[PDB]
Amino acid sequence: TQFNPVDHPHRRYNPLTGQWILVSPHRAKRPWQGAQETPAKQVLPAHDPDCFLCAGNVRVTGDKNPDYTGTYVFTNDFAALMSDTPDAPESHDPLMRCQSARGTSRVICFSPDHSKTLPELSVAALTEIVKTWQEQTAELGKTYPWVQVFENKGAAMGCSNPHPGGQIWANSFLPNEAEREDRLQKEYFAEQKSPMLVDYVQRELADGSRTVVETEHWLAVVPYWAAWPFETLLLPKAHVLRITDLTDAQRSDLALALKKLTSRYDNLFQCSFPYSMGWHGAPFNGEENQHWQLHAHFYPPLLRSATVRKFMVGYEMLAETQRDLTAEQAAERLRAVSDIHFRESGV
Amino acid sequence: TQFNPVDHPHRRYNPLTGQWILVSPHRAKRPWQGAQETPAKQVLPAHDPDCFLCAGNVRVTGDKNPDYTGTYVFTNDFAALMSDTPDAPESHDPLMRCQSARGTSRVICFSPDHSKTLPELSVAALTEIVKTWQEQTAELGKTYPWVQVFENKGAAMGCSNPHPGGQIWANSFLPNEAEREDRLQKEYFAEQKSPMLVDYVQRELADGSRTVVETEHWLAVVPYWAAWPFETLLLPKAHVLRITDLTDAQRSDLALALKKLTSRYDNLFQCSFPYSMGWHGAPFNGEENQHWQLHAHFYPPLLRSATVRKFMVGYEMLAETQRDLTAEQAAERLRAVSDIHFRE
Ligand SMILES: O=c1ccn([C@@H]2O[C@H](COP(=O)(O)OP(=O)(O)O[C@H]3O[C@H](CO)[C@@H](O)[C@H](O)[C@H]3O)[C@@H](O)[C@H]2O)c(=O)[nH]1
Ligand SMILES: O=c1ccn([C@@H]2O[C@H](COP(=O)(O)OP(=O)(O)O[C@H]3O[C@H](CO)[C@@H](O)[C@H](O)[C@H]3O)[C@@H](O)[C@H]2O)c(=O)[nH]1
Ligand SMILES: [Fe+3]
Ligand SMILES: [Fe+3]
Ligand SMILES: [K+]
Ligand SMILES: [K+]
Ligand SMILES: [Zn+2]
Ligand SMILES: [Zn+2]
């Protein structure tokens, strides 16, 4: 029979991780008698008097938040890393070894509006969000080789506070993913003489099958090797090492691309769409980081609808990540909707 | 200053995967205003007239389940892999490439009792399950190099049907986890001339800090490099390549170990403790597999209680797995409860 990706299971390679993804095109056909998701409330007040993240509010620690009107960053009250933790008793033990971990964790409130997420923020407000990301990265980068900007959106994504915002965790070392991505990109570069992701963008631009968002300076695709159902990869069309290297134009364009990307997500099921997202750029290790290409990953759990997510469990944990629909199907569904948040368009 | 694992963040290495785990011992003290889990109901019928996995019931596809006893295995009505899928077009492209994928998927009903989870089952019944896992492994191993026995238990673990049971997915290739575990174990062996987990078992025996369950032939510990809060690694004290290689004594002993382990898990929060678990053993690839050591991993998501789980999200996906308590603290908590199921 003729192989048909559209219908035959197969594995696809993730050149960033050196790992495969198993695709079973029709897995989703099976009866779902599992957990039903809890979709989020449409009606939240712009200011919650109890919210530990709201402006002019006291934190769990008593610390009072400023009367902030744009973004706001403060050191996490429960940081995952400290800048002066004692060094660990590092050894060579092939079985039980440990290593030192220093760094910090900061919290970023997107805006004082307790009820408005990224797709609902103005391009101007989004641009401030980017400037803050850059600011944070430049400062921490001065001290730590790995600065990780991210965000957990929605209960399904492990958020512990409903205020819109993100986090920044800095590390004295290169975490798993960073070291891997770093090495893999470096090898490709050494061999191909061009940045892996830069070449990837070209290919995607010429194809279109997986394109979701395309702006003057950015591209958002459902990567070939996507893991999560509607997972996306957001990249600059031009070669850029870190977030801190974006030009002002790329910067405002990024704000636009984000709004569009997240609006499509929310438009997909006509609901606030949960996800985990974050930025990957060259580490501040003082090395030649030409092999790098800045990029953001978006990992959303929703699959069938607003109340049915994907669960990366048994097989995925013990063997390999699996997907129940192609990246092409995912991208197509994402292209079908509007890139204007339903709340803003009034449709 | 003076380093103390329960107070200071640090990273631990997982030699099975060659990856690190970030430990931040006081992270769970933060307020939690996130999701609240829904704990599984305690009272369920022994037979559910509408259950697709229940004895004598008609499946989704209309096929009928027999009036079985003990375990019941059938080919998944929506298998994720097939035995005859056409080969993919293989290339050596550095950015966009695919590979073939063949195999099968089977469903294993633990017993005809719709309401009895593993720890609720007798050692005899559990022994029957072990026999089936073995038969299934030996069987599929004839055709596939990778046989994956597993179980998704509880809503939080993405289970799609409440009947107590698991799955077996076979693959014509070695999936990610298999390939790496094989490679790393092989490397270790070549250098140490001893199996990685065999040595590991001894090192743990000589410590006891992370021990949770210990029987004549098995050991269950919160691995040194544990990711999930109360994760455990279950393994035979003696070198055993695959589950099919167990002696009958080892097998009957494994059932005992399983009952004990799972009873402790349920007792931790006095609820049916969810998890994803599976078995890892030598692949059927006709190669020198002495480096292998059979073992089971249990990945339970619960963290603070019956309604609050651990989430591997943002930082974890973009950077590195992280934990809010030490392997040692968790092991202690597990040891603190009775190995007698709270509802026996
Ligand atoms: O008064 C307050 C209230 C909250 N916070 C912080 O606000 C953050 C909100 O972060 P969010 O992204 O919602 O989730 P977290 O509580 O950090 O935990 C999630 O994100 C982590 C990093 O991905 C994971 O390790 C957890 O398992 C996952 O639940 C938390 O870190 C809190 O420590 C404060 O600093 N002060
Ligand atoms: O009439 C029926 C009813 C059910 N089933 C099968 O019963 C199985 C029950 O397996 P379970 O462990 O409960 O979950 P799954 O539905 O397979 O899916 C989970 O397990 C997979 C393997 O880890 C993941 O890919 C998913 O994302 C995760 O939700 C399913 O696969 C069904 O296809 C049949 O074959 N016939
Ligand atoms: Fe990346
Ligand atoms: Fe393993
Ligand atoms: K958030
Ligand atoms: K199950
Ligand atoms: Zn708020
Ligand atoms: Zn049943």
Residues, Cβ < 5 Å to ion ligand 8? B 48, 51, 53-54, 114, 163
**Measured between alpha carbons, how far is A331 from A221 in angstroms, rounded to an integer?**
7
What residues in B contact A100, CB-CB < 8 Å? 10-11
Residue B231: name the closest of B198, B275, B180, B280 by CA: B275
Compute the Cα dihedral for B155, B160, B163, B166 and give only its sign: negative
Query: What type of residue sits at position B254?
Result: L
User: From its phi and psi, is residue B155 left (phi > 0), alpha (psi between -120 and 50) or beta?
Assistant: alpha
| Residue for token pair 């609240």 | B36
Residue A73 to residues A140, B56, B135, Cα–Cα distance (Å): 13, 60, 58
CA atoms within 13 A on the CB side of A24: 21
The reported resolution of this PDB entry, expressed in Å, is 1.8
Task: Considering every ligand atom shown, identify the ligand nearest to the alpha carbon of residue B310 and give its number.
Answer: 1
For residue B256, which of B158, B145, B119, B162 has the smallest C-alpha distance? B119
Longest pairwise C-alpha distance within chain B = 67
Q: Give the Å distances, CA to CA, from B201 to A239, A266, A303.
A: 49, 49, 40
Q: DSSP 3-state helix, strand, coil percentages of chain B (rounded to 5)? A: 25, 20, 50
Tokens linked to A46: 């712009």
Closest ligand to Cα A161: 1
**B279, B80, B55: which is closest to B160 by C-alpha?**
B80
Tally the C-alpha atoms within 13 A of residue A53's C-alpha that lie toward its C-beta.
27
For residue B315, which of A176, A112, A284 has the smallest C-alpha distance? Answer: A176
Q: Name residues whose C-beta falls within 8 Å of residue A242's C-beta, 6 or more positions apart in sequence.
A: A137, A141, A281, A282, A292, A294
Quote the CA–CA distance of B137 and B99 in Å, as a whole number.
24
CA angle A310, A316, A322 (to 5 degrees): 65
Dist. CA A156 → ligand 1 center (Å) = 14
Cβ-nearest to A314 among B15, B20, B152 = B152
Structural element, H or E, at residue A74: strand A72-75
Closest ligand by atom to A114 CA: 7
Query: Residue A89: closest CA among chain B residues belongs to which residue?
Result: B3
Q: Is A167 left (phi over 0), alpha (psi -120 to 50) or beta?
A: beta
Q: Is residue B134 within 8 Å of residue B200, measured between CB atoms?
A: no
Contacts of A311 in chain B (CB under 8 A): 152, 157-158
List % helix, strand, coil for chain A (3-state, nearest 5): 30, 20, 50
Give the nearest ligand 1 atom to B310 CA: 27
Report the alpha-carbon distance of residue B62 to residue A178 in Å, rounded: 49
Q: Tell me, what amino acid is at A143? A: T
Strand-pair partners of B90: B98
- In chain B the beta strands, taken as DSSP E runs, fall at 10-14, 19-23, 72-75, 98-100, 103-109, 146-153, 165-171, 211-214, 218-221, 232-236, 275-280, 295-299, 302-305, 308-309, 322-323
State the burial class of residue A42 (Cβ atoms within 10 Å of its Cβ: 0-12, 13-18, 19+). exposed
Amino acid at residue number A251: R
For chain A, the maximum distance between any two Cα atoms, rounded to a whole number of angstroms, is 67
Instruction: Please name the residue whose Cα sits nearest to atom 27 of ligand 1.
Output: B311
- Residue A157 three-state SS: helix
Distance B296 CA to ligand 4 centre (A): 7
Residue entry with tokens 């973004």? A71
Q: What are the DSSP calls for B7-22, one per residue? A: TS-EEEEETTTTEEEE
In contact, B229 and B330? CB cutoff 8 Å: yes
- Ligand 1 atom closest to the Cα of residue B316 is 23
Q: What is the 3-state secondary structure (H, E, C) of B73-121?
A: EEECCCCCCCCCCCCCCECCCCCCCEEECCEEEEEEECCCCCCCCHHHC
Closest among B185, B190, B158 to B174, alpha carbons compared:
B185
Partner residue facing A34 (CB), from B60, B159, B225: B159
For B315, the closest of A1, A88, A150 (CB atoms) is A150
Q: Please report which residue ranges of A234-326 form alpha helices under DSSP H.
A: 248-269, 314-318
Residue among A15, A81, A94 minimizing CB distance to B188: A94
B chain contacts of residue A87, beta-carbon cutoff 8 Å = 3
Dist. CA B233–CA A314, nearest whole Å: 15
From residue A140, alpha-carbon distances to A37, A171, A175, B60, B341 in Å are: 37, 9, 15, 55, 50
> Which one of A107, A149, A157 would you pick to mutate in the ligand 1 pocket, going by the greatest count of ligand atoms within 8 A of its CB?
A107
Q: Which residues face A23 on adjacent strands?
A: A10, A323
Cα–chain-centroid distance for residue A123?
19
d(CA B91, CA B257): 46
The CATH-assigned architecture of domain B175-344 is: 2-Layer Sandwich (3.30)
End-to-end alpha carbon distance in chain A: 45
Inter-helix orientation angle B123-140/B248-268, to 10°: 120
Which of A15, A27, A320 minimises the CB distance to B175?
A320
Question: What gap in Å lies between CA B165 and CA B159, rounded to an integer?
Answer: 10
Q: Give CA–CA dist B150/A112, Å, rounded.
A: 46
Contact pairs from chain A to chain B, CB under 8 Å: 271
Element (H, E) at B240: none
Per-residue tokens: A129: 């969000």
Distance CA B263, CA A204 (A): 52
Distance between Cα A268 and ligand 5 center (Å): 20
| Cα Rg, chain B, nearest whole Å | 20
Radius of gyration of chain A (CA): 20
- Say whether B318 and A280 touch across the interface (CB within 8 A): yes
Which residues of chain A make contact with B175, given a CB cutoff of 8 A? 20, 22, 319-320
8 Å CB contact of A8 and B86: yes
State both tokens at A188.
């490709």
**Which residues of chain A neighbour B328 with C-beta distances below 8 Å?**
none
Q: Which two tokens stand for residue A24?
A: 């079973």
Question: Whose C-alpha lies nearest to ligand 2, atom 26?
Answer: A311
CB–CB of A176 and B320 under 8 A?
Answer: yes
Choose among A293, A307, A299, A290: nearest CA to A323. A299
Of all residues in chain B, the one with the smallest CA distance to A39 is B35
Is A285 exposed, middle or buried (CB count within 10 Å of its CB: 0-12, 13-18, 19+)?
middle
| Alpha-carbon distances, residue A311 vs A228, A302, A303, B155, B304 (angstroms) | 9, 9, 9, 10, 21
Hey, what are B125's tokens?
């019944």
Contact B311 A27 (CB under 8 A): no
Q: For the domain made up of A43-174, give the CATH fold.
A: HIT family, subunit A (3.30.428)
d(CA A338, CA B176): 37
Q: Residue B256 to residues A137, A164, B122, B125: CA-CA distances in angstroms?
A: 53, 49, 9, 10
Residue spans of beta strands (DSSP E) within B130-210: 146-153, 165-171
Domain B43-174 and domain B175-344, same fold? Reply is yes
Residue A319: phi and psi, rounded to 5, are -135, -70
CA gap A54, A27 in Å, rounded: 42
Q: List Cβ neighbours of A148 (8 Å cut-off, separation of 6 or more).
A: A168, A169, A170, A171, A175, A178, A278, A279, B315, B318, B319
Minimum CA–CA partner of B153 in chain A: A314
Residue nearest to atom 11 of ligand 1 (CA): A159
**Ligand 1 contact, A76 CB (< 6 A):** yes
Method of elucidation: X-ray
φ, ψ for residue A303 (rounded to 5)? -130, -60
Spatial CB neighbours of A187, under 8 Å, sequence gap ≥ 6: none
Query: Distance between CA atoms of B292 and A201, rounded to whole angstroms?
Result: 41
Number of H helices, E strands in chain B: 6, 15
Q: Where are the domains of chain B?
A: 43-174, 175-344
- Which residues on adjacent β-strands are paired with residue B73? B108
Is residue B303 left, alpha or beta, with left meaning phi > 0 and alpha meaning psi from -120 to 50? Answer: alpha
A160, B307 Cβ separation under 8 angstroms: no
Q: Find the closest chain B residue to A104 by CA distance.
A: B9
Q: What superfamily would CATH give domain A175-346?
A: HIT-like (3.30.428.10)
Contact (CB, 8 A) for B196 and B185 = yes
**Which ligand has the shortest distance to the CA of A65?**
1
Q: Which two tokens stand for residue A14?
A: 């993730």
CA–CA distance from A209 to each of A203, A205, B169 (Å)? 10, 9, 31
CB of B70 within 8 A of CB of B131?
Answer: no
Distance separating alpha carbons of residues A251 and B168, to the nearest angstrom: 49
Give the full edge-to-edge strand order of the sheet including A146-153: A72-75, A103-109, A165-171, A146-153, A275-280, A295-299, A232-236, A218-221, A211-214
Show Cβ contacts of residue A85 under 8 Å, excluding neighbours closer than 6 positions.
A100, A101, A102, B8, B9, B10
Q: Which of A78, A81, A108 to mutate to test the pocket of ligand 1 (most atoms within 8 A of CB)?
A: A78
DSSP string, A20-72: EEEE-TTGGGS---S----PPPS---SS-TT-TTSTTPBPTTSPBPP--SS-E
Closest CA to B325 of A76, A317, A80, A82: A80
Measure the CA–CA gap between B43 and B272, rounded to whole angstroms: 11
CB half-sphere exposure, A125, CA atoms < 13 A:
19
> Residue ranges of the alpha helices (H) in chain A?
123-141, 176-192, 196-207, 248-269, 314-318, 327-335, 342-345
